[PDB]
Amino acid sequence: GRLL
Amino acid sequence: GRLL
Amino acid sequence: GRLL
Amino acid sequence: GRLL
Amino acid sequence: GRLL
Amino acid sequence: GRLL
Amino acid sequence: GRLL
Amino acid sequence: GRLL
Amino acid sequence: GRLL
Amino acid sequence: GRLL
Amino acid sequence: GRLL
Amino acid sequence: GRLL
Amino acid sequence: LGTSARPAVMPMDAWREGDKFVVEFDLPGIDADSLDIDIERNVVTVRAERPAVDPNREMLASERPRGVFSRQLVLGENLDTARIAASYTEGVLKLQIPVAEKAKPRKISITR
Amino acid sequence: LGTSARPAVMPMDAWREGDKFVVEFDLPGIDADSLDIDIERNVVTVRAERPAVDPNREMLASERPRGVFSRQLVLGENLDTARIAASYTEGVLKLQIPVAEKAKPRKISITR
Amino acid sequence: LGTSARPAVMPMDAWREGDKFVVEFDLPGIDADSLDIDIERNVVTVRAERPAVDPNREMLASERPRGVFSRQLVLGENLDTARIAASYTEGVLKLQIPVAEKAKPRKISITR
Amino acid sequence: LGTSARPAVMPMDAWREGDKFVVEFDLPGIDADSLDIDIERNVVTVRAERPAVDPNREMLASERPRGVFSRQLVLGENLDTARIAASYTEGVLKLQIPVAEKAKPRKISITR
Amino acid sequence: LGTSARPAVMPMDAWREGDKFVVEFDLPGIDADSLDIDIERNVVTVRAERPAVDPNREMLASERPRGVFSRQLVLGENLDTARIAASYTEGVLKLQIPVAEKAKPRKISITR
Amino acid sequence: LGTSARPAVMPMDAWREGDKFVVEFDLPGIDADSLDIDIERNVVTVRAERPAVDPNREMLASERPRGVFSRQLVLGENLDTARIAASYTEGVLKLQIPVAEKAKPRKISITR
Amino acid sequence: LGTSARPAVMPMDAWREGDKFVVEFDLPGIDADSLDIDIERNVVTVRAERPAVDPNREMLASERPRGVFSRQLVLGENLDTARIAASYTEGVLKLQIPVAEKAKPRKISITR
Amino acid sequence: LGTSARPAVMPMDAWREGDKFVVEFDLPGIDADSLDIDIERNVVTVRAERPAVDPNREMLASERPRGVFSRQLVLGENLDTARIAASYTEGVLKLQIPVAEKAKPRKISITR
Amino acid sequence: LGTSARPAVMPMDAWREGDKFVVEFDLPGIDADSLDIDIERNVVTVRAERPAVDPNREMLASERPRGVFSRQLVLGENLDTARIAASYTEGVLKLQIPVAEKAKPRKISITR
Amino acid sequence: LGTSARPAVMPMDAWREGDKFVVEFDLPGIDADSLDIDIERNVVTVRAERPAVDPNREMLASERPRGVFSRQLVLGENLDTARIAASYTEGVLKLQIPVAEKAKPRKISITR
Amino acid sequence: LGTSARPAVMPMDAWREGDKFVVEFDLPGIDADSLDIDIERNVVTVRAERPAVDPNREMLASERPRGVFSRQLVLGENLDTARIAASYTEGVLKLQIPVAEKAKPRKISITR
Amino acid sequence: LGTSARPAVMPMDAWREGDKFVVEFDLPGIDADSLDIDIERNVVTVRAERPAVDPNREMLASERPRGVFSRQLVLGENLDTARIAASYTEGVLKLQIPVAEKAKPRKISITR
Ligand code: PRO
Ligand code: PRO
Ligand code: PRO
Ligand code: PRO
Ligand code: PRO
Ligand code: PRO
Ligand code: PRO
Ligand code: PRO
Ligand code: PRO
Ligand code: PRO
Ligand code: PRO
Ligand code: PRO
Ligand SMILES: [Cl-]
Ligand SMILES: [Cl-]
Ligand SMILES: [Cl-]
Ligand SMILES: [Cl-]
Ligand SMILES: [Cl-]
Ligand SMILES: [Cl-]
Ligand SMILES: [Cl-]
Ligand SMILES: [Cl-]
Ligand SMILES: [Cl-]
Ligand SMILES: [Cl-]
Ligand SMILES: [Cl-]
Ligand SMILES: [Cl-]
Ligand SMILES: [Cl-]
Ligand SMILES: [Cl-]
Ligand SMILES: [Cl-]
Ligand SMILES: [Cl-]
Ligand SMILES: [Cl-]
Ligand SMILES: [Cl-]
Ligand SMILES: [Cl-]
Ligand SMILES: [Cl-]
Ligand SMILES: [Cl-]
Ligand SMILES: [Cl-]
Ligand SMILES: [Cl-]
Ligand SMILES: [Cl-]
Ligand code: NA
Ligand code: NA
Ligand code: NA
Ligand code: NA
Ligand code: NA
Ligand code: NA
Ligand code: NA
Ligand code: NA
Ligand code: NA
Ligand code: NA
Ligand code: NA
Ligand code: NA
């Protein structure tokens, strides 16, 4: 779960 | 309908 | 004379 | 104990 | 009517 | 037309 | 003595 | 050249 | 070398 | 009575 | 260990 | 010349 | 512009003058038709409207607050709100509420 | 997080709809078990709690307000608080309080 | 300096202790002669004055707030304000108001 | 309180009404004795004073601005300041200055 | 009111739950007709509109944000955006995006 | 949007170039039809309007200032305002006012 | 002055015009030699420089921003960045990027 | 809450009373067990702690500052810190430090 | 440092002393060579420069404002600017301008 | 303390050094065990943790930021993220990413 | 106005000039009678007073700071405070304190 | 950039560890040549310089503070400053000063  |  |  |  |  |  |  |  |  |  |  |  | 839901507020002076409580509001340039004073058990509500400028009028300056003005005062039990007197002169709304002291009032003492 | 002593506040819309006064609160993601509506002589207090995140859960974002929510409304004398109706749907708490006008009400006149 | 019209405020803790509601104010260095507790139907008003420094006294530091202190509490209907107890010790004004629950109180249910 | 050296300012509306330039100030509760209108070659200065409250009067609220009010307007060459008309009603000071257009005025053209 | 060009933003919680990435938005009182979820190669955009109040309705309070809501999330390469699942309940929009780990991923070592 | 009564302002550079005084304004995307340069005895007023976006056009970004732009310059007595030259290129309004020195000017000496 | 590492930003309008996405920047008084448009897979970067004033020039006013201007836009996958068209007129940089919709696009449905 | 590393500060009055220097701190509701006065060559440090509320106690108001209080005074060479006298009454900590003037002190003259 | 285009300002006192108008500026540590007083039809401009510190000098403190100081006063028509007297002592620039009242001046009356 | 959901940020310098892009972070007093560098298609994420102080340790000063540090860089298409080199020395994390220019790159021309 | 307990501060430059430490204060328009320089073991205190304006004088501008000015400097052990020299000219108070280096001073080495 | 006269400050942790007082500074990327530790009777001064970037180097990001860093600590009489130990590792400057308690120290008692 990667997010900027 | 009165309110403070 | 009282008041909030 | 109620208070505004 | 001019004014600064 | 999409843009961030 | 007037001044703005 | 003067100006306020 | 590009970067946002 | 002096103090900083 | 004292310090201001 | 030292000073705090 | 001030609205019902976000009214503009107007400044108030309040003081006791012997047996009367007096309130004054700066409300310049108000049409009496707008002024409404609502009194509740112990709450005074002052509402006024000063109309917006004609949308077709180009103002060079337009600093004066317009729209809905409103202020609510919560008054003490000793104020005979029913006998309120209100006047509007020189752009000032003045309210006079008689003070009606209760018999043999409580005085709270503080222990040490 | 909001606490009893420093509650988080939730936004409110309020309006009169004919013979009823309506209040709506944005209270998304609230467990009904938490919702409490206390009515006082003329005061409505709304309190809700939305639990804090599991301390062992690593959030990547945690912007939503949590903890204790509370708002108090001071209602006018004309509101029949005893007959309040409350519903919670789509994350909105809606209150409906009947308006009960008194007989032959006061209209304050302003002198010039 | 705080005045009647713009009083200084003093910090307050408030909590319910079983059948009593307790309020505490930090009011250090107050002369008991100044302390006044006014109770209204359901409103407690605390007022104190701490005198200004002698104008002829050159202070090297003068951070402590002076003049008129005032705080008003709006209490719920269940508080027997008439039986208030007040004490002042270690610069703390403590108020104890008995809680007097009404018979068979309302519990508002929320529909879904 | 506003002073000569740091006057309080009062809000202003300004607009052109055909052949007249109009300025209005909110100046409620002003004694005409205080109002002074000074006109300079092309500068209008409005000054008013609203007295401070009796130092011996304990106000419960004192929000209304007091002391010296002043505003200076720099008017264009086309304003016949000498023919200014001033009136004060409903707490509003209204100024009417005739506009006196010069003959065959300049129109600046912009090159590309 | 929030617009397309200056949207209102809504609060978000985000966390990884094993093999799924979860995002939740507080969006109370939204008509499903408005909700739009746009997914781009690796960008999720959430857009909702909550209509403005009838201009003819006099609100006594109008604190709830209205108009266009929008939030854009830039997702990592490991998120299978194509398999997004979205639900709206209790005024909360919940998104579930499966996490699709790549084979034998890079681990960057740091020299001293 | 900027209005007559609250105009948007545009940035200005000003400098003396030998016998000419030069002023430049950033006014990009202005229709020449809007540009107006008014010169008063010794006052230059620059006014421009850049129209608002079609209300029916959904902008994704709308950062550029729109509406009425205005700036007034108070020029010294030595500026021959009557001979002003104005040009608009690359979105820059440039004004050139000849400097017309008076004969045998005053030089104020300071005593010690 | 704006630098590479801390650029000055310039205002932008953006909108979709049928099958084209349009971006406009206020960039008055820019030398075309400075303008650089870099396009990345889906990122448009606009960079301009407006030179600093001759250090030996005494400005009477110097409000216009100078130095490096830069803005980066992150474009959606549907924008055919390769076919960008750019023009600079009246101090406005206008970009036109064709929109290239994908076949049979996803429409995310929301469960209740 | 104030900590050792980020203490809460308490207000102080300081003045010279003939041959004594006096300092007073507002420290209401402090347990004497906490009060610590450390004196250094010429530095007085006052430290107090007022305990945090029982975590299990639901406060309705909790405005009073709690935790570690600390203030350090740098005293002049003429203060006989060794003979400090300290008292705590009505929530006020009062310090009395004798002033011990040196023999035939320096008076700096200023040249013109 | 203050520049021509963004001068440092210096504080001013101004008052009328019978038939003279007096202005004083705090301008400590100024070289008379820098002081320039320019008088325009009715405008007084004061300009001074206090040089920057030698770039090669390591200051331990450098709080004093340096560079270009400037202040412009717009004087009323009654000031005989031509007869200005200026002196600089104890770091104060004092200006004395005679007041030259016009014959039979206008007094504007206000209608009710 | 910085958390995953609200990380502390650390300052960064970035520059191109011929055929390499270099990034440096101030990350003093970090245990290498914490440092994690995640590289995504074109995104570099730097994460570090500096542990909180022993809760039982009384700090006299505790200004240094602690907890989770994180920074994400969005890199251009020309950066060969796969060949990143990272080193940590003197409390500085330095990243070196080779720049891999594409063949015959686009140069956007601007029309007039 | 600045007081003993809340003095106005005056700007200071400080630098070492070979074997002397120099301090300069901007103190324009000060009567020498007010200037007081107190030197303590290693502390220099500068105090000045500039009188308030005659209460009966109507100022048109009153920007200059008045009342008590004070600044305290904590000097290093190497300063021979006893040999201080002070002068006041052009509204600047200049202090010259000889530097008296100790024999064979410590140089702290840093390990790696 | 930080200068001698306006240094950049660096964060500090301080604590007592049994018989030693410890101070740590975040000073990443500092050349040991710059570090200077000056100890005065009871004052520790830490000074470091981190050089500015080559003016000819175009930085894409330049967030890290540069120039002169300085912090002064005023230590208590019990610190044996002469025996200070200093080390610099992982970009952290650590100081260890032995604590040297005096014989039979004063304990100030507080009267009631
Ligand atoms: O305690 C009491 O009963 C008194 C009576 C007046 C108010 N206090
Ligand atoms: O003065 C009165 O008596 C009227 C009656 C209604 C309200 N005002
Ligand atoms: O609706 C009712 O009647 C119940 C009775 C207690 C409060 N609610
Ligand atoms: O340039 C000119 O002469 C014209 C005449 C009116 C104003 N402009
Ligand atoms: O440097 C390498 O090749 C290893 C492989 C996994 C990531 N790092
Ligand atoms: O005082 C004077 O008369 C000179 C003449 C030029 C300006 N000053
Ligand atoms: O769930 C689906 O498959 C549909 C297809 C278009 C987008 N949503
Ligand atoms: O200069 C001196 O010696 C005198 C003695 C007292 C202080 N000043
Ligand atoms: O109206 C008038 O004519 C008078 C004359 C002096 C000023 N006002
Ligand atoms: O328009 C073109 O085709 C040229 C080719 C390189 C970039 N611009
Ligand atoms: O450690 C030492 O002894 C040396 C002597 C001068 C200062 N440092
Ligand atoms: O008053 C005294 O003498 C005791 C001795 C130790 C400190 N206090
Ligand atoms: Cl508005
Ligand atoms: Cl009009
Ligand atoms: Cl929090
Ligand atoms: Cl987790
Ligand atoms: Cl005050
Ligand atoms: Cl005294
Ligand atoms: Cl005041
Ligand atoms: Cl009174
Ligand atoms: Cl709005
Ligand atoms: Cl309605
Ligand atoms: Cl707007
Ligand atoms: Cl559209
Ligand atoms: Cl700058
Ligand atoms: Cl020049
Ligand atoms: Cl806290
Ligand atoms: Cl409890
Ligand atoms: Cl500067
Ligand atoms: Cl030097
Ligand atoms: Cl924290
Ligand atoms: Cl410890
Ligand atoms: Cl003051
Ligand atoms: Cl006078
Ligand atoms: Cl800088
Ligand atoms: Cl470079
Ligand atoms: Na308007
Ligand atoms: Na959390
Ligand atoms: Na005082
Ligand atoms: Na008053
Ligand atoms: Na509305
Ligand atoms: Na718009
Ligand atoms: Na410049
Ligand atoms: Na608490
Ligand atoms: Na300097
Ligand atoms: Na801590
Ligand atoms: Na005054
Ligand atoms: Na730089």
Short mmCIF file of N, CA, C and O and ligand atoms in Angstrom, two decimals, chain N residues 1 53-55 57-59 61-62, chain V residues 3 5, ligand 38:
data_model
loop_
_atom_site.label_atom_id
_atom_site.label_comp_id
_atom_site.label_asym_id
_atom_site.label_seq_id
_atom_site.Cartn_x
_atom_site.Cartn_y
_atom_site.Cartn_z
N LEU N 1 -7.26 14.28 19.38
CA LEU N 1 -8.60 13.76 19.62
C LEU N 1 -9.44 14.65 20.52
O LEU N 1 -8.93 15.27 21.46
N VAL N 53 -8.04 5.27 16.46
CA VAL N 53 -7.50 4.13 15.73
C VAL N 53 -6.70 3.24 16.68
O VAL N 53 -5.99 3.72 17.57
N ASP N 54 -6.81 1.94 16.47
CA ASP N 54 -6.02 0.94 17.16
C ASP N 54 -4.58 1.42 17.25
O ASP N 54 -3.93 1.62 16.22
N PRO N 55 -4.03 1.61 18.46
CA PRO N 55 -2.66 2.14 18.56
C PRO N 55 -1.65 1.31 17.81
O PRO N 55 -0.62 1.85 17.40
N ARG N 57 -2.09 0.00 14.86
CA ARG N 57 -2.31 0.10 13.43
C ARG N 57 -1.50 1.27 12.87
O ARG N 57 -1.67 2.41 13.31
N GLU N 58 -0.62 0.98 11.91
CA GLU N 58 0.15 2.03 11.25
C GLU N 58 -0.68 2.63 10.13
O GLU N 58 -0.87 2.02 9.07
N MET N 59 -1.16 3.85 10.35
CA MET N 59 -1.90 4.57 9.32
C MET N 59 -0.93 5.26 8.37
O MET N 59 0.08 5.83 8.79
N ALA N 61 -2.42 7.59 6.28
CA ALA N 61 -3.08 8.88 6.42
C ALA N 61 -4.11 8.76 7.53
O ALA N 61 -4.75 7.71 7.66
N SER N 62 -4.23 9.79 8.36
CA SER N 62 -5.21 9.77 9.44
C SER N 62 -5.76 11.17 9.68
O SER N 62 -5.62 11.75 10.75
N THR V 3 5.19 10.60 12.76
CA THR V 3 4.62 9.27 12.58
C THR V 3 4.53 8.93 11.10
O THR V 3 4.76 9.77 10.22
N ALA V 5 1.84 8.45 9.50
CA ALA V 5 0.76 9.23 8.90
C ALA V 5 1.05 10.72 8.89
O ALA V 5 0.48 11.44 8.07
NA NA Y 38 -2.88 7.73 14.56
#
